[PDB]
Design a protein around this ligand. Structure first.
Ligand SMILES: *Cc1c(COP(=O)(O)O)cnc(C)c1O
Ligand SMILES: *Cc1c(COP(=O)(O)O)cnc(C)c1O
Ligand SMILES: *Cc1c(COP(=O)(O)O)cnc(C)c1O
Ligand SMILES: *Cc1c(COP(=O)(O)O)cnc(C)c1O
Lengths: 417, 417, 417, 417
């Protein structure tokens, strides 16, 4: 909680509290609500399925929604290699499964993940994460044979560094463990967020990603991606990895928006990799639930038929220009990062020092809340802008104007915590 | 897939495939269906909630169903100490949370669990597990600082051993790591299933359980229980741990039946233990989902209103009697174990050698399936008996008669694989 | 410090402090002094080699003592298979090397060792150990993928158990992990002390050892032995494993007496196992030191020339009968375990309860010390009897008389701590 | 075996093989032989002790050389805080002990060590290591809760980077894991080579070292140093850490040259840190061997009496000039690093690209060997220069001229393997 709000109902990008007050949702429940709240087609799909079968573990009997969803997810995944899908409940358990699939297929034990990453809260995925110290404190020891590498930062760079220089420097950092203590032939996979979500909406440069991808292929390391936050149209392409040229992951984790916030996740992977493990050795009883699966079928169709991928791209381009214009009048805005309706607005004390301004960031979100918009922060000083992709233009403009007013009010000293 | 069969719809304890064939459910989807399939109150709760709010992450904003469920679960948990509740999506993640809370509260690392145990498929919970069925081939290394001890087997005992002798022998095995390499003062937690589900419906004797509970208290080791399979009325008490005298767990995992097979789980623990961690330390985006929460509220209401606990105790004792009578005519039944509607029928080659007859158990399964009843085996030779608690007596008797006929056909060599 | 006493010099089985006081050594510095203190032939070997070459790391240049010892150790190892040897500095690092060799050769992770065992003090060997709890306390997490099983106890048995029943019970416990959570095809080796040293001079029954050995052969698990305490003639055979019928280990650790207490250890293993790893990957700078190697060549020569294996066998049988006769007069002696000049004298409060009497044990060692004999306890209540193998009969009889007097004085309450 | 030749005898910096061929030693058995081969004072100390007492485990009885050495090591260790010493056999076990002392004193789990480091071949010290030459292939999983950070590289730097810029960039890398997944408050220790030996004779800049030292003190992390290769006058100070301003380590490992290559090591630590662990919990049987202890007393004496600290400083400054002069005529020499008689001469394909030239390096080694000098490489392309500190000027000049001719011959293409 940030402000003790109790939601009674919601539709599209609008939240209504128990009292009747209205809010514009710029969070979409951490990008679980790409399709907007209570989308008519998803509600109906949930209702109709519940009438027939609430649950049977698909490992004992197939159900139609699970069969249909498994085929479809295999189709829409990036690349042309034959795919298989394994269902879970959460992004967390999907990233735990990624570790399992990679170890079992390769016969290798080490996993490489990123500082700044967030992969979930189960013991495997929580070890991979590098987003929060409180995810390691008191609960160790963690999963063995996990190595963290730094994710490329395009904002706080060295003087005179180009995109090319940053890519090379961070790739050299990527190689350092492999040239010292970490055998590449013993690394099962690299797990990467094509754009880091919780880390602050940070996109790896094209050249950096191509270097890692090639490194993996050349050493027989699996290239895995986490699309749990950045997938299903969020970046203005179906998959965040499609922001890069011709990269097909060996394993991909999908969650959050998948079933409009119903607990469903998937690992989608190359056929051969996915066949190294199955039920009943790896299984979640309520995973691939038929009600959740019907919910997902409807939400996937909504993304396609309402053109939400295209809308995220064009609205994202627009929101990027609006925030850039705001940056010209508000020097507290240090960096505008936007790929689709998917933004990190980084607030700094000074543009030259780039020193984080967590105080100002919290004031903005407090102002916004008092003026009917829900927005939160990342890593202290970064506003996350991830509204449902269905957000009508009038509501988007309304929210942007509140944010512009927030910046002015924080400048004048008119906001207190 | 176990049955290679597509389920179309289901109600109560009757399953209907895509060709209209009817089946009596003696599996209840691994005891996730205590309240029976598509219960009228649960379907309505799901459909009504979906219309208002499909999802918002409870870590940002509260919703009424989640808050009400949190209160109700704290109230119905065993013991009189004030509890806190932490939601997840799966039993697996609830067991991961137990490791976290125990380690955080005690400041110790080691977790003790049992051989034969099943706790889930994430990296924490699957380390704790000890069923041959869900073993960790190809996926290691697992979570460090986990020791397995043997679970008391009251069937294959040494000649002349009483329940007293069994309790003492197994408690002596329990103490052996603590008297060698495992420091009691560095063990955070002992986690036990009060009755082992996947292990074969095996109940720890009263005296063994008291000895462990006391050992934990004397050394400041938390005593945790897994009620994911055996909870919510399955044993003919609300919780399996209530089959024992005056035992309040520090930590308890709950799942499967909690929300009628909708993905929801909980860790319910003593207030002090639960306060040792933050969250972000333990959070899932879709955990405590309002549709799932409303479904759970309704299944809990059904357990109360239809007196399902008492019905489980009553039908359980009936089913025990019935199988005991069958045992008198079919010496292939080596052991009848039953606490509530919750039975392990163990098949053997000879009454004295107690050699497992996995082939005979396979043949019973086939016969039952060919005759309209769904039942599975555990450990090859144990028939597991876990119908929905709502199973009408008429249907229970039908299933029981099919089982009787299966034993007859198997004796006479009339079933072929 | 155990005795709080400065040794000036020593020879054979006699120790001399800085005051001139003489002691009979029944410890032989934890069996590192099989050949007796300052043996003339060993002293000469040390001095002559120190004038030629104190050290060069044999991984850069070979030296003649190292090459000769390497061939000698390959030849005297139990069995007929071609062997190779790898040198270390301590028993501990030899056991660390066993883990390495087994994991490297098999491509598997898990190591099985015994409760009650002692393998050393480095992170690998100390994880495998299971005697002192202090050895795990405060220093975790330890090496992952290690499982401890119980070592067969022939003294505190169930009423009416034969040696056959003991072997079968303990072999059943051995198998329990493999039938639950531990995959046999993922375990690299079993490390076993053929007689447990620090465990209390406990010998696995023949039948037990055969069952484990066969289990290992059948599953491709390496069968590894620790001969650091019990090797080099201590049991009245060259190797403790030779007390068993036709067992050739895949790997064997040797230390302590190898170089008369100079730091030198070895792993002796089958050729194909030993070639799975080499220097410079696995290497200790001062391992295979030419002075230590010359000392070792000399001590091995003494064992042969003075017939110390047979002398241990015949003096050990004599000493066993002496302790058996003491036992008749002194009921505090519950168990006499003795194989060669290698004994555990177990002290108990009552012969039927077998309750440990640590108090009587420490009083015996106090009396012995005040009367010119050095002897210590294991596990509180067991007198450890391991004199140098060269101990003259007159001196052995002298020490045995003091112990008889000690037992009489402890009975009469004449000893105050 | 590196050279395929058998050493028969050696004295000072000259080695003689079995055929009578003389070699000048620029390896000194990886810096185990600081005081020169078979030094008269050390040979005599070995022989004289061997006559009195070859061994007794000093945990049972004190011996005089062990007592004197313990006092002398506590005295000559850097800084003015009271120290305690714990003996081992090898640098590997001393570094394993460092982990143990740090975890036990702090009650924290995590250990930070460096890429490019070498700390030994036991499971603890080998996990900490980061030398490609000592990779842990096939032997995992390793010790849990170990994080590697990059060591400052002052040769392959970014354009226009100063020593200051290097110190700040590498300190920024040091902090990255602490700002992502590694809690400072849960890390027990940072272990650092003041100059990395096996890493290629790489010295951390003063400013970097002060930053790490300060960070450790401010977070309650123990600051540990490894002086096994770089201690005992090798750098031209007694300890390599004395190359830096006012740094007193909490823990220091010492070995290799400590007893002229006899197996002996020590952890020297602040008194309150060392008291956290005891014996018999932590103990090696043959550690602090009296013959080894006597050898060490004599080598320490030679270091003082022959003024070898000063000799290394002035011969090293001389050797740096000679190699710098060679660099002028031989552009294949990319970098000359030298602190005492202790150098890394790095060979490259081109002065601007700095591409490593391993082929040129192995050819130089081969030529040198063919003309009577012993020298090896590190990291493929770095000539390592560590002769005994006693090397007479005439012999040094002789060896330096052979190296000069080697560069000439490789340049002209006259060397083939
Ligand atoms: C939220 C998130 C997860 C974990 O998903 P849950 O459903 O909360 O377990 C994993 N990866 C990324 C990138 C996320 O944003
Ligand atoms: C099935 C089960 C679990 C795990 O639940 P999932 O929802 O399948 O993760 C945990 N414990 C027990 C006793 C179980 O039967
Ligand atoms: C003492 C001992 C060790 C360890 O030897 P160190 O040389 O003290 O490291 C290993 N195994 C056994 C059986 C021992 O008695
Ligand atoms: C050689 C070395 C060690 C290990 O010493 P051993 O005696 O070979 O175990 C540790 N640290 C450094 C810096 C070394 O050079």
């Amino acid at each position: 909680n940030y402000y003790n709000l109790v939601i009674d109902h919601a539709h599209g990008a609008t939240l209504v509290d128990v009292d009747g007050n209205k809010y514009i949702d710029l969070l979409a429940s951490a990008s679980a609500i790409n399709v907007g709240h209570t989308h008519e087609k998803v509600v109906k799909a949930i209702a109709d399925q519940a009438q027939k079968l609430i649950h049977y573990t698909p490992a004992y009997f197939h159900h139609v929604p699970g069969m249909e969803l498994s085929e479809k997810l295999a189709k829409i995944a990036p690349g042309n290699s034959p795919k298989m899908v394994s269902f879970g409940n959460s992004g967390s358990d999907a990233n735990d499964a990624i570790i399992k699939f990679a170890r079992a297929y390769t016969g290798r034990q080490y996993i490489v993940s990123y500082m700044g990453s967030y992969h979930g809260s189960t013991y495997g995925s929580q070890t991979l994460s590098g987003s929060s110290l409180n995810m390691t404190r008191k609960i160790g020891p963690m999963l063995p044979s996990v190595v963290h590498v730094p994710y490329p930062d395009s904002y706080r760079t060295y003087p005179g560094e180009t995109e090319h220089d940053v890519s090379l420097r961070y790739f050299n950092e990527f190689k350092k463990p492999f040239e010292s203590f970490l055998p590449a032939d013993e690394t099962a996979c690299v797990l990467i967020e094509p754009i880091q979500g919780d880390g602050g909406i940070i996109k790896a440069p094209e050249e950096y990603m191509q270097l890692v991808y090639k490194f993996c292929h050349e050493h027989g390391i699996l290239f895995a991606i986490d699309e749990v936050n950045q997938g299903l149209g969020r970046t203005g392409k179906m998959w965040a990895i499609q922001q890069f040229k011709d990269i097909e992951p060996d394993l991909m984790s999908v969650g959050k928006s998948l079933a409009s916030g119903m607990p469903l996740s998937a690992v989608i992977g190359k056929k051969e990799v996915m066949q190294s493990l199955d039920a009943p050795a790896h299984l979640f009883t309520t995973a691939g639930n038929p009600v959740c699966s019907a919910a997902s079928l409807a939400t996937l169709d909504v993304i396609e038929y309402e053109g939400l991928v295209e809308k995220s791209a064009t609205d994202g381009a627009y929101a990027k220009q609006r925030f850039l214009e705001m940056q010209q009048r508000h020097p507290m805005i240090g960096d505008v990062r936007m790929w689709g309706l998917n933004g990190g607005i980084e607030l700094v004390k000074d543009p030259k020092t780039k020193e984080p301004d967590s105080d100002a960031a919290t004031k903005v979100i407090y102002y916004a809340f008092a003026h009917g918009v829900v927005i939160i922060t990342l890593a202290g000083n970064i506003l996350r802008f991830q509204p449902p992709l269905v957000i009508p233009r009038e509501q988007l403009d309304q929210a942007l104007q509140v944010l512009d007013d927030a910046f002015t009010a924080v400048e004048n000293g008119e906001v207190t915590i």
